């Protein structure tokens, strides 16, 4: 309830530990208070650090996908049916407000290329069709550069996914990666020993050659 | 290409493209088989579930 | 788990005969370029 206590309790792993209690949902009163605990957390913050409680808490966890079927169920207590619609509208904006490319530009320029819902969302890639060319097609060339020099056991699959979704939405970008030689990099990285970077680069190399 | 000694550029370009395309068709075949080796296993579990 | 297997086999079996098309259209383009060079020379 008190606003300054919300930034006191955030020095922990609270909400994904709490969402692990939410996915059980056997008692049918623990879910009515742990959804109210999600609301009283999210409503009473006077800061921009509610986004700290999405990345730890909401978008990067198995809670937002669970809240879709939480709406589908038939609860009787009227505050619950407004608790889900408040959380769905608060987290409905929370997926695309960093799904801006800025953040993605904050991800790409600073590096580390983490797993984020901005990569899997197609409304991201619906928007930034020409935005790599708005950055003079360096913004792609900075992405294949970090794909080149580094081994990256986790974020190379993210980097292989990023060149794949752009190519499906701009057919002239297939000629762009040919000038950079990034296709032969994906040819090498699809033969990697790790299976996640193999599966992502196999989809990446098969998106390059849909039509020739 | 309608001109001589440009067809050598074109046929080499098709040759390296066929080499890449046959590799991907080979790669997606054993990836489909590696999926279906895992996916078909325990469908008799999964159907009963 | 089931949507991982479903979207695997839905995308690949559409990218398989479409990619088999782009290879079978290309291997018969390579054959006529082999002949018409030998035919011209």
């Amino acid at each position: 309830f008190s606003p300054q206590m919300c930034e006191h309790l955030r020095r922990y792993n609270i909400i994904p530990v709490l969402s692990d209690i939410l996915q059980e949902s056997v008692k049918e009163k623990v879910t009515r208070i742990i959804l109210a605990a999600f609301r009283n957390f999210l409503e009473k913050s006077v800061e921009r650090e509610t986004r700290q409680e999405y990345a730890l808490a909401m978008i990067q966890c198995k809670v937002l996908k669970q809240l879709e079927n939480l709406e589908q169920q038939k609860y009787d207590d009227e505050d619950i049916s407004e608790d889900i619609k408040f959380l769905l509208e608060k987290l409905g904006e929370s997926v695309q407000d960093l799904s801006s490319f800025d953040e993605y530009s904050s991800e790409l320029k600073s590096g580390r290329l983490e797993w984020s819902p901005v990569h899997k969302s197609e409304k991201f890639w619906r928007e930034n069709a020409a935005r790599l060319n708005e950055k003079n097609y360096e913004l792609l060339k900075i992405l294949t550069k970090l794909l080149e020099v580094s081994d990256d056991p986790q974020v190379l699959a993210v980097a292989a996914h990023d060149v794949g979704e752009y190519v499906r939405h701009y057919p002239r970008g297939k000629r762009v990666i040919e000038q950079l030689g990034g296709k032969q990099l994906v040819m090498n990285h699809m033969h990697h020993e790790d299976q996640q970077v193999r599966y992502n680069a196999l989809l990446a190399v098969q998106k390059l050659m849909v039509h020739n | 290409p309608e001109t001589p000694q440009e067809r050598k550029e074109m046929a080499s370009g098709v040759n390296t493209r066929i080499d890449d395309l046959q590799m991907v068709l080979n790669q997606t075949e054993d990836h489909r088989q590696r999926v279906l080796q895992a996916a078909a296993k325990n469908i008799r579990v999964w159907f009963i579930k | 788990n089931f949507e991982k297997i479903e979207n695997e086999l839905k995308e690949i079996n559409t990218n398989q005969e479409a990619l088999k098309r782009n290879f079978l259209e290309l291997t018969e383009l390579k054959f006529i370029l082999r002949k018409t060079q030998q035919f011209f020379d």
Side-chain angles (χ1 to χ4, degrees), chain A residues 1-99 111-212, chain B, chain C:
Chain A
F1 279 96
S2 160
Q4 59 183 356
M5 301 182 72
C6 316
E7 292 90 8
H8 201 168
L9 265 299
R10 67 171 181 178
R11 309 176 158 91
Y12 289 101
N13 198 261
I14 297 291
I15 308 106
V17 161
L18 260 64
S19 184
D20 192 21
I21 312 298
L22 199 148
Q23 57 97 28
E24 299 177 353
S25 86
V26 283
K27 191 49 162 303
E28 193 37 64
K29 76 168 62 163
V30 60
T31 183
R32 92 185 156 201
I33 189 64
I34 212 158
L35 283 165
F38 282 9
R39 177 173 180 178
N40 280 186
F41 271 160
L42 197 41
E43 183 65 13
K44 299 296 183 181
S45 63
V46 279
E47 292 177 350
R48 298 296 299 278
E49 295 302 320
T50 59
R51 300 288 182 268
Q52 186 173 355
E53 304 183 340
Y54 308 142
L56 269 183
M58 293 326 187
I59 46 156
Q60 199 215 45
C61 181
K62 269 80 191 176
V63 44
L64 179 56
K65 304 159 292 306
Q66 209 191 327
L67 284 151
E68 267 92 43
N69 53 275
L70 260 283
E71 186 265 335
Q72 302 166 171
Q73 296 194 332
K74 200 184 142 203
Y75 300 123
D76 194 327
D77 187 25
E78 75 288 347
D79 61 47
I80 300 173
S81 197
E82 312 314 318
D83 200 331
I84 44 175
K85 297 206 171 176
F86 181 74
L87 264 292
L88 276 178
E89 73 198 351
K90 281 298 174 193
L91 295 186
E93 63 177 4
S94 307
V95 288
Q96 67 261 9
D97 46 18
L98 79 167
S99 178
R112 305 168 197 170
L113 267 297
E114 296 176 354
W115 265 118
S116 160
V118 312
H119 304 85
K120 284 256 200 291
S121 48
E122 212 165 4
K123 311 194 65 50
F124 173 83
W125 299 101
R126 192 171 183 172
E127 188 263 329
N128 43 74
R131 181 163 171 167
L132 313 184
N133 323 332
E134 292 300 91
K135 206 183 162 65
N136 54 29
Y137 304 94
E138 192 45 69
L139 197 40
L140 211 176
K141 313 193 312 209
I142 199 179
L143 196 158
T144 185
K145 175 225 184 186
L146 70 94
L147 189 67
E148 172 58 275
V149 307
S150 69
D151 198 316
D152 289 357
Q154 178 248 317
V155 307
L156 190 137
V158 176
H161 185 217
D162 285 336
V163 291
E165 266 304 308
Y166 164 71
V167 156
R168 296 215 292 108
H169 299 345
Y170 199 46
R172 304 295 303 274
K174 313 166 171 152
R175 201 174 169 194
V176 171
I177 201 167
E178 184 198 315
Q179 300 299 317
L180 310 170
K183 158 165 182 166
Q184 318 302 317
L185 270 299
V186 182
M187 280 307 198
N188 203 314
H189 284 298
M190 68 180 290
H191 263 298
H192 210 78
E193 57 270 2
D194 198 6
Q195 60 182 357
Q196 189 186 358
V197 296
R198 168 207 173 192
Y199 159 73
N200 286 268
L202 194 140
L203 263 71
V205 73
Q206 81 185 0
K207 280 165 189 167
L208 294 202
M209 298 180 286
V210 307
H211 79 283
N212 212 11
Chain B
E2 269 200 299
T3 51
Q5 300 312 300
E6 293 288 328
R7 62 185 68 251
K8 289 290 189 291
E9 172 185 7
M10 289 297 293
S12 54
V14 171
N15 273 316
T16 177
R17 273 294 305 211
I18 278 182
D19 183 277
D20 298 341
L21 213 52
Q22 188 50 49
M23 275 207 309
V24 174
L25 261 66
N26 179 47
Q27 274 299 316
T28 190
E29 262 310 301
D30 74 89
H31 193 238
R32 172 184 158 86
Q33 284 321 293
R34 191 190 163 262
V35 160
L36 285 173
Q37 277 278 351
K41 275 200 305 171
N42 320 289
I43 59 171
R44 297 295 179 92
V45 175
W46 284 346
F47 292 152
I48 290 178
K49 297 291 231 181
Chain C
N1 191 18
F2 291 149
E3 214 167 321
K4 268 191 172 181
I5 306 299
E6 168 66 77
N7 277 95
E8 189 76 25
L9 301 194
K10 190 177 297 313
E11 187 274 346
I12 282 176
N13 268 28
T14 50
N15 287 15
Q16 201 67 29
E17 56 97 20
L19 218 57
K20 192 72 68 69
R21 177 171 179 176
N22 202 4
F23 177 74
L24 279 161
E25 211 172 52
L26 209 63
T27 181
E28 80 179 5
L29 190 141
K30 191 205 62 182
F31 286 164
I32 67 161
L33 288 179
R34 186 57 199 86
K35 297 293 184 182
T36 201
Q37 156 67 74
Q38 192 180 249
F39 160 68
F40 272 170
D41 189 74

mmCIF file of all heavy atoms in Angstrom, chain A residues 126-146:
data_model
loop_
_atom_site.group_PDB
_atom_site.id
_atom_site.type_symbol
_atom_site.label_atom_id
_atom_site.label_comp_id
_atom_site.label_asym_id
_atom_site.label_seq_id
_atom_site.Cartn_x
_atom_site.Cartn_y
_atom_site.Cartn_z
ATOM 1 N N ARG A 126 6.613 -5.700 -37.589
ATOM 2 C CA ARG A 126 5.713 -5.003 -38.499
ATOM 3 C C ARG A 126 6.060 -3.522 -38.590
ATOM 4 O O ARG A 126 5.867 -2.900 -39.641
ATOM 5 C CB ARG A 126 4.266 -5.189 -38.040
ATOM 6 C CG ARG A 126 3.214 -4.752 -39.043
ATOM 7 C CD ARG A 126 1.827 -5.181 -38.589
ATOM 8 N NE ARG A 126 0.795 -4.842 -39.565
ATOM 9 C CZ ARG A 126 -0.467 -5.247 -39.485
ATOM 10 N NH1 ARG A 126 -0.860 -6.009 -38.472
ATOM 11 N NH2 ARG A 126 -1.341 -4.892 -40.417
ATOM 12 N N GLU A 127 6.582 -2.947 -37.507
ATOM 13 C CA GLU A 127 6.892 -1.525 -37.438
ATOM 14 C C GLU A 127 8.256 -1.199 -38.036
ATOM 15 O O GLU A 127 8.355 -0.376 -38.952
ATOM 16 C CB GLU A 127 6.818 -1.055 -35.980
ATOM 17 C CG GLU A 127 6.935 0.447 -35.784
ATOM 18 C CD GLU A 127 8.345 0.883 -35.431
ATOM 19 O OE1 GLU A 127 9.066 0.092 -34.787
ATOM 20 O OE2 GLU A 127 8.735 2.010 -35.801
ATOM 21 N N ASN A 128 9.313 -1.838 -37.538
ATOM 22 C CA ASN A 128 10.674 -1.507 -37.942
ATOM 23 C C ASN A 128 11.079 -2.237 -39.216
ATOM 24 O O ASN A 128 12.088 -2.949 -39.241
ATOM 25 C CB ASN A 128 11.645 -1.822 -36.802
ATOM 26 C CG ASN A 128 11.347 -3.150 -36.136
ATOM 27 O OD1 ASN A 128 11.617 -4.215 -36.690
ATOM 28 N ND2 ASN A 128 10.738 -3.091 -34.959
ATOM 29 N N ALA A 129 10.301 -2.059 -40.284
ATOM 30 C CA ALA A 129 10.653 -2.653 -41.567
ATOM 31 C C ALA A 129 11.840 -1.935 -42.197
ATOM 32 O O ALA A 129 12.744 -2.568 -42.752
ATOM 33 C CB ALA A 129 9.443 -2.622 -42.503
ATOM 34 N N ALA A 130 11.849 -0.605 -42.125
ATOM 35 C CA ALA A 130 12.806 0.195 -42.879
ATOM 36 C C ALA A 130 13.738 0.864 -41.873
ATOM 37 O O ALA A 130 14.616 1.652 -42.242
ATOM 38 C CB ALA A 130 12.103 1.221 -43.755
ATOM 39 N N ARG A 131 13.579 0.526 -40.591
ATOM 40 C CA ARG A 131 14.296 1.254 -39.546
ATOM 41 C C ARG A 131 15.777 0.884 -39.516
ATOM 42 O O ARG A 131 16.624 1.708 -39.142
ATOM 43 C CB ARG A 131 13.614 1.027 -38.192
ATOM 44 C CG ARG A 131 14.264 1.758 -37.031
ATOM 45 C CD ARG A 131 13.413 1.873 -35.814
ATOM 46 N NE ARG A 131 14.203 2.406 -34.705
ATOM 47 C CZ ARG A 131 13.692 2.864 -33.567
ATOM 48 N NH1 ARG A 131 12.375 2.906 -33.401
ATOM 49 N NH2 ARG A 131 14.498 3.323 -32.619
ATOM 50 N N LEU A 132 16.119 -0.328 -39.960
ATOM 51 C CA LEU A 132 17.525 -0.658 -40.169
ATOM 52 C C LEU A 132 18.111 0.176 -41.303
ATOM 53 O O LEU A 132 19.297 0.525 -41.287
ATOM 54 C CB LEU A 132 17.691 -2.153 -40.453
ATOM 55 C CG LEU A 132 16.984 -3.188 -39.574
ATOM 56 C CD1 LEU A 132 17.399 -4.579 -40.015
ATOM 57 C CD2 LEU A 132 17.300 -2.977 -38.108
ATOM 58 N N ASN A 133 17.286 0.511 -42.298
ATOM 59 C CA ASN A 133 17.739 1.388 -43.369
ATOM 60 C C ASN A 133 17.645 2.855 -42.967
ATOM 61 O O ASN A 133 18.287 3.708 -43.590
ATOM 62 C CB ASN A 133 16.927 1.130 -44.636
ATOM 63 C CG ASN A 133 16.601 -0.337 -44.827
ATOM 64 O OD1 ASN A 133 17.333 -1.213 -44.373
ATOM 65 N ND2 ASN A 133 15.494 -0.609 -45.507
ATOM 66 N N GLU A 134 16.830 3.171 -41.952
ATOM 67 C CA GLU A 134 16.840 4.517 -41.379
ATOM 68 C C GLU A 134 18.164 4.803 -40.687
ATOM 69 O O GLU A 134 18.610 5.955 -40.625
ATOM 70 C CB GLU A 134 15.679 4.693 -40.398
ATOM 71 C CG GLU A 134 14.286 4.684 -41.017
ATOM 72 C CD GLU A 134 14.072 5.789 -42.033
ATOM 73 O OE1 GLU A 134 14.329 5.565 -43.235
ATOM 74 O OE2 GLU A 134 13.619 6.880 -41.629
ATOM 75 N N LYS A 135 18.803 3.765 -40.153
ATOM 76 C CA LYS A 135 20.162 3.858 -39.645
ATOM 77 C C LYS A 135 21.258 3.493 -40.644
ATOM 78 O O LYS A 135 22.293 2.945 -40.231
ATOM 79 C CB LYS A 135 20.287 3.125 -38.305
ATOM 80 C CG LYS A 135 21.409 3.643 -37.381
ATOM 81 C CD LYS A 135 21.527 2.818 -36.111
ATOM 82 C CE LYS A 135 22.874 3.036 -35.439
ATOM 83 N NZ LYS A 135 23.053 4.433 -34.958
ATOM 84 N N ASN A 136 20.982 3.661 -41.955
ATOM 85 C CA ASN A 136 21.961 3.644 -43.057
ATOM 86 C C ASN A 136 22.827 2.498 -43.576
ATOM 87 O O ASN A 136 23.988 2.702 -43.943
ATOM 88 C CB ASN A 136 22.807 4.951 -43.122
ATOM 89 C CG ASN A 136 23.547 5.351 -41.818
ATOM 90 O OD1 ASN A 136 23.930 4.544 -40.980
ATOM 91 N ND2 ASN A 136 23.744 6.656 -41.673
ATOM 92 N N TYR A 137 22.275 1.286 -43.678
ATOM 93 C CA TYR A 137 22.112 -0.083 -43.162
ATOM 94 C C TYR A 137 23.390 -0.581 -42.468
ATOM 95 O O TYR A 137 23.926 -1.608 -42.901
ATOM 96 C CB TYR A 137 22.351 -1.063 -44.319
ATOM 97 C CG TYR A 137 21.476 -0.857 -45.538
ATOM 98 C CD1 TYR A 137 21.909 -0.084 -46.612
ATOM 99 C CD2 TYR A 137 20.234 -1.469 -45.631
ATOM 100 C CE1 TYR A 137 21.113 0.097 -47.729
ATOM 101 C CE2 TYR A 137 19.433 -1.296 -46.747
ATOM 102 C CZ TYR A 137 19.876 -0.515 -47.789
ATOM 103 O OH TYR A 137 19.078 -0.345 -48.896
ATOM 104 N N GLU A 138 23.922 0.142 -41.475
ATOM 105 C CA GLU A 138 24.726 -0.095 -40.272
ATOM 106 C C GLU A 138 23.981 -0.839 -39.159
ATOM 107 O O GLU A 138 24.549 -1.763 -38.568
ATOM 108 C CB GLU A 138 25.302 1.247 -39.800
ATOM 109 C CG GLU A 138 26.384 1.162 -38.730
ATOM 110 C CD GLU A 138 27.423 0.097 -39.026
ATOM 111 O OE1 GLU A 138 28.202 0.281 -39.983
ATOM 112 O OE2 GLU A 138 27.468 -0.916 -38.298
ATOM 113 N N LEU A 139 22.730 -0.458 -38.861
ATOM 114 C CA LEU A 139 21.972 -1.121 -37.797
ATOM 115 C C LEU A 139 21.848 -2.625 -38.032
ATOM 116 O O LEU A 139 21.792 -3.407 -37.075
ATOM 117 C CB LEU A 139 20.585 -0.496 -37.665
ATOM 118 C CG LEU A 139 19.812 -0.763 -36.369
ATOM 119 C CD1 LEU A 139 20.719 -0.710 -35.144
ATOM 120 C CD2 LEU A 139 18.661 0.219 -36.227
ATOM 121 N N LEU A 140 21.801 -3.049 -39.294
ATOM 122 C CA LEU A 140 21.970 -4.468 -39.584
ATOM 123 C C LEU A 140 23.444 -4.848 -39.524
ATOM 124 O O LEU A 140 23.795 -5.942 -39.064
ATOM 125 C CB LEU A 140 21.380 -4.797 -40.958
ATOM 126 C CG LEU A 140 20.767 -6.165 -41.305
ATOM 127 C CD1 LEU A 140 20.190 -6.092 -42.704
ATOM 128 C CD2 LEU A 140 21.713 -7.363 -41.195
ATOM 129 N N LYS A 141 24.322 -3.946 -39.971
ATOM 130 C CA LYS A 141 25.744 -4.263 -40.061
ATOM 131 C C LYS A 141 26.396 -4.286 -38.683
ATOM 132 O O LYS A 141 27.431 -4.929 -38.486
ATOM 133 C CB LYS A 141 26.443 -3.266 -40.989
ATOM 134 C CG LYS A 141 25.698 -3.047 -42.304
ATOM 135 C CD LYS A 141 26.526 -2.319 -43.361
ATOM 136 C CE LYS A 141 27.212 -1.078 -42.824
ATOM 137 N NZ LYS A 141 27.415 -0.057 -43.890
ATOM 138 N N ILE A 142 25.805 -3.585 -37.710
ATOM 139 C CA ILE A 142 26.269 -3.726 -36.333
ATOM 140 C C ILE A 142 25.765 -5.038 -35.735
ATOM 141 O O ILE A 142 26.363 -5.568 -34.792
ATOM 142 C CB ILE A 142 25.858 -2.495 -35.491
ATOM 143 C CG1 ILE A 142 26.699 -2.385 -34.214
ATOM 144 C CG2 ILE A 142 24.370 -2.500 -35.161
ATOM 145 C CD1 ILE A 142 26.355 -1.180 -33.355
ATOM 146 N N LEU A 143 24.687 -5.604 -36.286
ATOM 147 C CA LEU A 143 24.117 -6.820 -35.718
ATOM 148 C C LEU A 143 24.861 -8.047 -36.234
ATOM 149 O O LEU A 143 25.062 -9.023 -35.503
ATOM 150 C CB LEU A 143 22.618 -6.887 -36.038
ATOM 151 C CG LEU A 143 21.648 -7.833 -35.312
ATOM 152 C CD1 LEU A 143 20.237 -7.284 -35.449
ATOM 153 C CD2 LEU A 143 21.676 -9.274 -35.800
ATOM 154 N N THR A 144 25.256 -8.027 -37.507
ATOM 155 C CA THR A 144 26.065 -9.120 -38.030
ATOM 156 C C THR A 144 27.508 -9.026 -37.550
ATOM 157 O O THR A 144 28.246 -10.016 -37.613
ATOM 158 C CB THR A 144 25.999 -9.154 -39.559
ATOM 159 O OG1 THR A 144 26.703 -10.305 -40.040
ATOM 160 C CG2 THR A 144 26.610 -7.901 -40.163
ATOM 161 N N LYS A 145 27.929 -7.851 -37.073
ATOM 162 C CA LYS A 145 29.282 -7.699 -36.545
ATOM 163 C C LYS A 145 29.419 -8.387 -35.193
ATOM 164 O O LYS A 145 30.410 -9.080 -34.933
ATOM 165 C CB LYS A 145 29.637 -6.215 -36.444
ATOM 166 C CG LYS A 145 30.978 -5.911 -35.795
ATOM 167 C CD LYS A 145 30.845 -4.779 -34.786
ATOM 168 C CE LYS A 145 32.188 -4.396 -34.187
ATOM 169 N NZ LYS A 145 32.042 -3.382 -33.107
ATOM 170 N N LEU A 146 28.425 -8.212 -34.318
ATOM 171 C CA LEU A 146 28.396 -8.952 -33.063
ATOM 172 C C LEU A 146 28.096 -10.427 -33.291
ATOM 173 O O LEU A 146 28.476 -11.264 -32.465
ATOM 174 C CB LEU A 146 27.385 -8.301 -32.110
ATOM 175 C CG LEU A 146 25.869 -8.349 -32.333
ATOM 176 C CD1 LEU A 146 25.195 -9.507 -31.594
ATOM 177 C CD2 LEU A 146 25.231 -7.012 -31.963
#
